[PDB]
């Protein structure tokens with residue numbers, strides 16, 4: 548009666564506070580729920596859809612290390628959940644090809660993320676790779692190879708999983724019922740704003756606070772935190788609405804009555820930003836300290852990182868063999884000869 552959950556990330560580097568708020572907290576909630584069996588993909592094949600230079604591919608090993616350390620440090624549990632490496636699941640390549648054959652190109656090119664990449668490519672006199680166009684087909688293979696029931700994804704990925712549902716329906720219609728139609732689990736509409744107040748917090752915008760930033764670094768990034776540009780002087784009445792300083796206090800400062808007093812004094816102008824910022828840094832550091840302590844243990848004994856990925860990959864490999872046996876039984880391309888050739 549247990550439902551399968553699958554979600555994860557391309558390995559791109561260290562995790563930041565936006566990852567925690569936007570997706571990691573929900574992944575812990577799902578993992579701790581007895582109704583679910585969680586699979587967390589480290590999607591190294593998907594990095595090739597945009598990063599193919601040898602120097603970029605070389606860094607994937609490092610990115611996987613950083614992902615495992617951050618995931619385990621916040622409590623993603625490798626015995627309860629299956630943390631696995633996408634490229635290490637041999638069946639993914641064949642299921643990807645099968646689904647490619649079942650997906651009309653016009654159903655991919657209308658996906659808003661793909662449409663935007665295609666418009667930018669044309670603008671720049673480039674052409675997207677066949678593999679990048681196939682991004683949601685490969686993601687559909689990830690989800691359905693696990694026969695997942697529930698898929699947490701960010702807003703820009705929901706349409707990918709809508710394609711996954713259509714691929715499951717097409718396969719089941721043509722060849723008989725094999726795949727659950729996955730349900731999308733939606734996140735918040737507002738990703739956490741970055742430290743410069745310009746868009747979401749992201750590695751590429753260089754406006755992130757990383758879960759692994761040390762105390763001094765958190766202090767410096769909060770010191771330079773974008774606030775209210777109209778608050779010219781320390782005595783000027785300020786705006787709390789839209790203000791990253793108070794967006795962060797609400798999320799990370801547990802002392803609710805202090806935050807409400809700061810907000811009032813800020814609107815009245817009778818508080819220095821240094822007071823509100825020093826306290827924000829103190830509370831983010833207190834929030835981060837237990838992560839840092841566990842991450843330090845994992846970095847000191849990397850066998851825990853290796854065991855995590857070994858255990859999860861072996862669990863996903865088992866599931867993938869069982870799923871593909873069912874796929875072969877229902878699709879049955881050259882079934883007799885492939886038996887003869889086994």
Ligand SMILES: N[C@@H](Cc1c[nH]c2ccccc12)C(=O)O
Pocket residue numbers: 553554555556557588590593685686689690698699700704
């Ligand atoms: N597309 C996700 C990674 C990913 C690959 N396969 C998935 C399956 C389910 C959820 C997420 C994924 C990302 O942008 O990082």
Ligand SMILES: [Ca+2]
Pocket residue numbers: 853854857
């Ligand atoms: Ca081992």
